[PDB]
Each structure stands twice: as C-alpha cells, then as structure tokens.
Swiss-Prot record:
Subunit structure of this chain's protein: Interacts with SPTSSA; the interaction facilitates MBOAT7 location to mitochondria-associated membranes (MAMs).
A biological process from GO: phosphatidylcholine acyl-chain remodeling
Protein name: Membrane-bound acylglycerophosphatidylinositol O-acyltransferase MBOAT7
UniProt membrane topology term: Multi-pass membrane protein
Domain of life: Eukaryota
Length: 441
C-alpha cells in the first residue's frame, strides 16, 4: 500500500461528490468549474511537472492550425516522440516525474490524438462539402466547429478521466456540456447498480495481496519451493492484479456516472467508448427525458463477468479496457500500413506496449501474447467443429481453465517489470505455457 497509490485512491473516491455537485451546474459554469478542478488537482498531485502536459496540448493545437490537412499523422508522431522525450528525463538529467505524471501523460496522449483525428475528419468533411456543392445534414459524431485554444484547455483538464480515465472522445465532452435538463438523467440508481461489488472486490484484493505478496518471487528462497508450490502461487498474483484494476476502474466509472458524463439514450445503441452509433432526438421536456431509459456504457471500461469467465483469449482481451481498446482499434489498427492480420496485430501490440512504458517487461509480455493468440486461432478453427455437444462443454471448461492460466502466466512477466527476474521466474516454471502453445500451434 504505497502512499502514491493511496493518494490515487483518495482522489478517485473524492471524484464522486464533485460529480454530484457539478451535475446540476449549467453548461458554461460546469465547463469552467470542471476545468478549474482538473487543473487544481493536476497541480496538487503533479507539482511543477504540469509543464510537460501544457507543452503537449500547445503543440497539438499549433499542429492543428499549422497543417489542418495532415494534422492526424503529424500530431500522432509529435505526441509519440514527446512521450519518448518525457520518459528519458533521467537519460538527460532532468528531474524525474511521479507516476501520476506518467498516467496523466498517457491519458492526454490518447485524448489529443483523438481530437486531432476529429479535426482532420471534420476538415476533410468541409472540403468535400464545398467540393460537391451539396451541403449534407448534421452527421452524428462530427464536431460542429474547430475548437479554440481555451476550449481545448477546458476539455483536456476535465476532472473526469484525467488521472485514471477512462478515455472519452471530445464529442462526448460536447454532448455532456450541451445535455439539456441535467436533473432528469438518473445518477444514484446506476451508481448503486455498479458500486455494489466495489467493497467486496477491494476486500478480495487486499486478501490476496496480504496472503501472497508479489515481492516473494524477487527473493531467491521462493524458488527452492517445489514446482507445485509455484503453480499454486502463480494464480493469486494475477488474481490480485485483476482485482485491483477492477476496483480502480469500477470506482472510476462510478465517479464518472456521478457527474452524468457519458449518459446517452438506450435507443442510440451506443458503443463502449465509441459513443452513439444511431442518432436519437434530444428530449423536448424534462418529463419526457425522465421517461426515457439511460445507460452509461460509453464510459464503461471493463466488464467483470465477461473477462473473468470468458472462453477465448481474443474475446477476453476485447472486453479488457474497452475504451482504450476502441481507441487503438480505430486510430492504429485501421491506419496500420500492413495488410496481414498477424502483422497488424503485432503493430497494435507494439504500440500498446510503447504506450504502457519503455520497460522490457511490457515488450516481452506483448510479444509473447501473439504466439498463444495464433495457436488458439489455429487450434479452435481446426478442432471445434469435430467435437460433440458434451465434448463442446468439456472443451469450453478446459479452455476457460487454460485461458485463465495463460493470463496468470503472462501476468507475472508483465508485473515483475525487470528483465532478469522475469526471465528467472519464467525459466523456473520451465516455459510450461510456451511449450504447450507451440504444441497447440
């Protein structure tokens, strides 16, 4: 229980009542108050290192006006290079940043890249508009006009999704500020419907944290235990990892609901992170708005049930970090210069690892993932069509066990974060999953 993550948790907790208070606020007042609160918390928890974020936003805006025709790739390359610059402060002797600053930088990178893509699409839209001579109607998902510098500053430093997230597109911010009759959309009932497992999840996390500490594998004497002891110990590590991320993300989603952010009509058939996909009429009367049913799935970042009890590794990863996953899938997977599915997936994995960090553990884990992914694709597409329904049930059960074991196996490599200890523990288990993965493939 580090002091920094303690401050992280208390910030996540206090994000809720401020959400309640700013729900009732009018559009301009809510906008300015959210920006001020985000900036204040950023200064409180980041110190003098907010200059990196400020420079990043200023550069994004300057590139938007400088090259509106090609702001997408320019902004993406600039932001990735500036991430490289920011993570090499020790290499250049500049003061080291707190992990708070690193997380804030990841979130800002995602947000600004999405904003640049929206500006690119909108500019191409106007260009085609006066090229064709037929002004089309307002299309859902497109920005009304180019944002101003102060508007971008207010959007970026929103207290929602500034420390943990989850990522939201700018269009979502505009729909949140322009949402009519804020008192009509329900907040307390969905907040209770999502916050019921948070205390239990937290207690479960602390249980596995105290019983089986992660630092044991750093100690050499742990390896003297028999291989079965390691096989039983390798489960609670990812149990605690998943449980802690579940607690944090459930708390973040509840805090985001508290402000009514991401609320859309159910008839819009909105997607996780993607916002609405079908246009719906804005409410005309507060009673009509209260009559409609509302969902907060756009901000939904994790599905506990699906990820915990999935069958295939592909779907398990799909339901993991749905927001950022959609962000990657659109801005990188679609724009990947490669054509092969394997190579495009490798590009996405490499960029995700680069986003997470420069430490070799991320690289090793996200490079080992494709092996089991391809092995699974081949084995499933080759054998699932041959088994009986009882054989199908047995395959599904054994597969759930194997998939959770693979998640554990790669979780150790992800969380040790050090090449030497990771390799030592990986050889300590005799590369069990890797050999089976090659056997499966």
């Amino acid at each position: 229980m580090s002091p920094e993550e303690w401050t992280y948790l208390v910030v996540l907790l206090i994000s809720i009542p401020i959400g309640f208070l700013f729900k009732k606020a009018g559009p301009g007042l809510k906008r300015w108050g959210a920006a001020a609160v985000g900036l204040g918390l950023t200064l409180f928890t980041c110190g003098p290192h907010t200059l990196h974020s400020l420079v990043t936003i200023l550069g994004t805006w300057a590139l938007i006006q400088a090259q509106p025709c090609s702001c997408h790739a320019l902004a993406l390359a600039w932001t990735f290079s500036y991430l490289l610059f920011f993570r090499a402060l020790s290499l250049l002797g500049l003061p080291t940043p707190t992990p708070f600053t690193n997380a804030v930088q990841l979130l800002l990178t995602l947000k600004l890249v999405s904003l640049a893509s929206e500006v690119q699409d909108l500019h191409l839209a106007q260009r085609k508009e006066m090229a064709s001579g037929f002004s089309k109607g307002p299309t859902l998902g497109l920005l009304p006009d180019v944002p101003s510098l102060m508007e971008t500053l207010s959007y970026s430093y929103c207290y929602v999704g500034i420390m943990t997230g989850p990522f939201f597109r700018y269009r979502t911010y505009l729909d949140w500020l322009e949402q009519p009759f804020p008192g009509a959309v329900p907040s307390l009932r969905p907040l209770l419907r999502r916050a019921w497992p948070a205390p239990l999840f937290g207690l479960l996390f602390l249980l596995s944290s105290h019983l089986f500490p992660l630092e044991a594998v750093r100690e050499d004497a742990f390896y003297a235990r028999p291989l079965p002891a390691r096989l039983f110990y390798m489960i609670p590590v990812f149990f605690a990892f998943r449980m802690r991320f579940y607690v944090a993300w459930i708390a973040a989603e509840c805090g985001c609901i508290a402000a009514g952010f991401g609320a859309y009509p159910v008839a819009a058939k909105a997607r996780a992170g993607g916002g609405p996909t079908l246009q719906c009429p804005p409410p005309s009367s507060p009673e009509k708005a209260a009559s409609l049913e509302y969902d907060y799935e756009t901000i939904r970042n994790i599905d506990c049930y699906s990820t915990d009890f999935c069958v295939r590794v592909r779907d398990g990863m799909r339901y993991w970090n749905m927001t950022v996953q959609w962000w990657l899938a659109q801005y990188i997977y679609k724009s990947a210069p490669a054509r092969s599915y394997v190579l495009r997936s490798a590009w996405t994995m490499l960029l995700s690892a680069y986003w997470h960090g420069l430490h070799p553990g991320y690289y090793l884990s996200f490079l080992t993932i494709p092996l089991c992914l391809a092995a699974e694709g081949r084995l499933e597409s080759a054998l699932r069509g041959r088994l009986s329904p009882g054989g199908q049930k047995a395959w599904d059960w054994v597969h759930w066990f194997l998939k959770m074991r693979a998640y554990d196996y790669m979780c150790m490599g992800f969380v040790l974060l050090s090449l030497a200890d990771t390799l030592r523990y990986w050889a300590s288990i005799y590369f069990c999953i890797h050999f089976l993965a090659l056997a499966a493939l």
